[PDB]
Amino acid sequence: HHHSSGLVPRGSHMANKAVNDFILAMNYDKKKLLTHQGESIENRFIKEGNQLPDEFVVIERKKRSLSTNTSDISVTATNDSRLYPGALLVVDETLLENNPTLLAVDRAPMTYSIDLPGLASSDSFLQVEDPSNSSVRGAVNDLLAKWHQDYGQVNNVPARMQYEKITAHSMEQLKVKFGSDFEKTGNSLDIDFNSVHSGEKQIQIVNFKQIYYTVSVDAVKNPGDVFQDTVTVEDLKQRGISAERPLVYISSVAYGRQVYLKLETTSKSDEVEAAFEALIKGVKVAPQTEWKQILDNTEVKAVILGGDPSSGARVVTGKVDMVEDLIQEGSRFTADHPGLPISYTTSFLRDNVVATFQNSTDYVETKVTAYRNGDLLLDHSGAYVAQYYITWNELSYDHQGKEVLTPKAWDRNGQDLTAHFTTSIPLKGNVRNLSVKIRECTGLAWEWWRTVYEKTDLPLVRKRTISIWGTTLYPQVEDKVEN
Numbered sequence: 261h262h263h264s265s266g267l268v269p270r271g272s273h274m275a276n277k278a279v280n281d282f283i284l285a286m287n288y289d290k291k292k293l294l295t296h297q298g299e300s301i302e303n304r305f306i307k308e309g310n311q312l313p314d315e316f317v318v319i320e321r322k323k324r325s326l327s328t329n330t331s332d333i334s335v336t337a338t339n340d341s342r343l344y345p346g347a348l349l350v351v352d353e354t355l356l357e358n359n360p361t362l363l364a365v366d367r368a369p370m371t372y373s374i375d376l377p378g379l380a381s382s383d384s385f386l387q388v389e390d391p392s393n394s395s396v397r398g399a400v401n402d403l404l405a406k407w408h409q410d411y412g413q414v415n416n417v418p419a420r421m422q423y424e425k426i427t428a429h430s431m432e433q434l435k436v437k438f439g440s441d442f443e444k445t446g447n448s449l450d451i452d453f454n455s456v457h458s459g460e461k462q463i464q465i466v467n468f469k470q471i472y473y474t475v476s477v478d479a480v481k482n483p484g485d486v487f488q489d490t491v492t493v494e495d496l497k498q499r500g501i502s503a504e505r506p507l508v509y510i511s512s513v514a515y516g517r518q519v520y521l522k523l524e525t526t527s528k529s530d531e532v533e534a535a536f537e538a539l540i541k542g543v544k545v546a547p548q549t550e551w552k553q554i555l556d557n558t559e560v561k562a563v564i565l566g567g568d569p570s571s572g573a574r575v576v577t578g579k580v581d582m583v584e585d586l587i588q589e590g591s592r593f594t595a596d597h598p599g600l601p602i603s604y605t606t607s608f609l610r611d612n613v614v615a616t617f618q619n620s621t622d623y624v625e626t627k628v629t630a631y632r633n634g635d636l637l638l639d640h641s642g643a644y645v646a647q648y649y650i651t652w653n654e655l656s657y658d659h660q661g662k663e664v665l666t667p668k669a670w671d672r673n674g675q676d677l678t679a680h681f682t683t684s685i686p687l688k689g690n691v692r693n694l695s696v697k698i699r700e701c702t703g704l705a706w707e708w709w710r711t712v713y714e715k716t717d718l719p720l721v722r723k724r725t726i727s728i729w730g731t732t733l734y735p736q737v738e739d740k741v742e743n
């Protein structure tokens with residue numbers, strides 16, 4: 261097969277065979293090529309207390325790490341010309357970053373299969389003579405319009421739903437969860453991370469993928485097979501291809517609609533998970549209780565990557581009312597609109613093993629505990645002098661995370677008071693060891709003062725009215741709580 265000149269003729273099968281041998285000969289570490297380790301910052305943390313309007317919150321810190329390992333690459337962009345089934349990609353830092361470098365060299369014909377419901381055998385294959393985003397998308401769209409006319413109109417299809425959620429802490433941890441390129445849509449979601457670590461909010465992120473169809477490509481027998489005879493080893497080298505920087509092809513793409521949902525509540529109820537969940541499922545088993553209180557304190561921002569004209573709606577549907585709306589909009593697929601790429605997978609060209617990526621990060625999980633403010637009300641309408649001795653500790657946290665309890669005492673402590681006297685003592689959630697003592701002067705020489713109330717560590721509640729009344733010999737007291 262050798263040519264007299266000793267050259268390898270561009271465009272000959274010998275050219276393509278050298279390419280095939282070039283790739284087959286590459287040795288590399290799949291593990292090390294596709295691995296990212298974030299930052300190992302696993303120090304020790306400080307305990308802290310934060311007073312805010314209607315409550316006191318203690319912020320505890322715990323040590324967690326998030327690790328992911330998947331062959332599935334989620335798509336953010338809406339019109340990426342690099343992301344078509346069969347596309348050749350380079351394995352780079354840029355592939356890990358979901359911003360890949362495409363290898364646009366002369367492509368050989370390729371055959372694809374779509375897995376659309378109600379579609380037979382031979383009608384599920386598409387032949388694409390010169391694979392590119394345009395030509396492959398053009399091929400499926402043709403088929404879709406056909407399918408649309410003898411199924412998707414008639415039959416409710418519907419779509420394949422995949423739900424996935426997490427509690428937002430860092431952008432970095434959101435990246436390991438949803439993809440290296442999540443920052444774009446995370447930044448559109450307005451995720452107030454500040455107020456998460458500062459106790460003021462709890463945020464969760466949920467991803468809804470609705471899959472209309474998937475198109476994919478059979479394993480390739482020879483690495484050579486994807487190139488025209490015009491492509492040569494020199495060309496691959498000119499474009500930086502080597503063992504150190506080998507290549508994958510995308511072996512399937514999932515098309516449909518996908519939404520990202522930010523559920524942001526003010527309620528530190530650290531029992532938000534269920535109230536968010538029931539809102540997702542839309543089960544509505546008596547929304548006028550505890551779950552209702554927190555769902556009424558939920559802001560919602562959503563980024564939608566629909567089956568519609570390719571662009572992302574960034575809408576802030578505001579209230580949780582318009583969440584069922586979203587899970588419903590792309591529910592059925594009729595083939596009136598081909599959805600867009602929602603996720604894709606890649607396989608090494610050398611040998612077809614699917615490339616799985618490995619991401620990790622350490623992040624700070626912040627637990628939040630809320631102690632609500634209350635008021636202590638006092639009512640004195642007895643025919644006697646009384647004195648109160650009201651006492652407590654206000655709790656705070658010093659750098660070093662130790663418990664600081666500084667003692668306090670009501671100002672009018674010890675004063676004689678007579679009827680009718682009423683006051684109202686605001687007690688913030690950081691108060692501990694409440695003591696209330698009330699004595700009354702009976703006028704008896706032998707029992708000058710009688711204590712009519714004496715409690716310690718009086719539980720802080722939203723509302724406590726201690727009323728006293730009656731006479732010097734028959735005082736009456738009521739300890740009324742309201743929560």
Ligand SMILES: OC[C@H]1O[C@H](O)[C@@H](O)[C@@H](O)[C@@H]1O
Nearest residue numbers: 640676677678679680681682
């Ligand atoms: O505590 C002072 C007390 O003095 C008398 O009892 C009345 O003038 C009351 O209304 C007042 O509350």
Ligand SMILES: OC[C@H]1O[C@H](O)[C@@H](O)[C@@H](O)[C@@H]1O
Nearest residue numbers: 645646676677701702703708
């Ligand atoms: O010595 C205690 C004395 O304090 C005040 O002067 C009055 O309230 C008296 O009635 C009370 O008994």
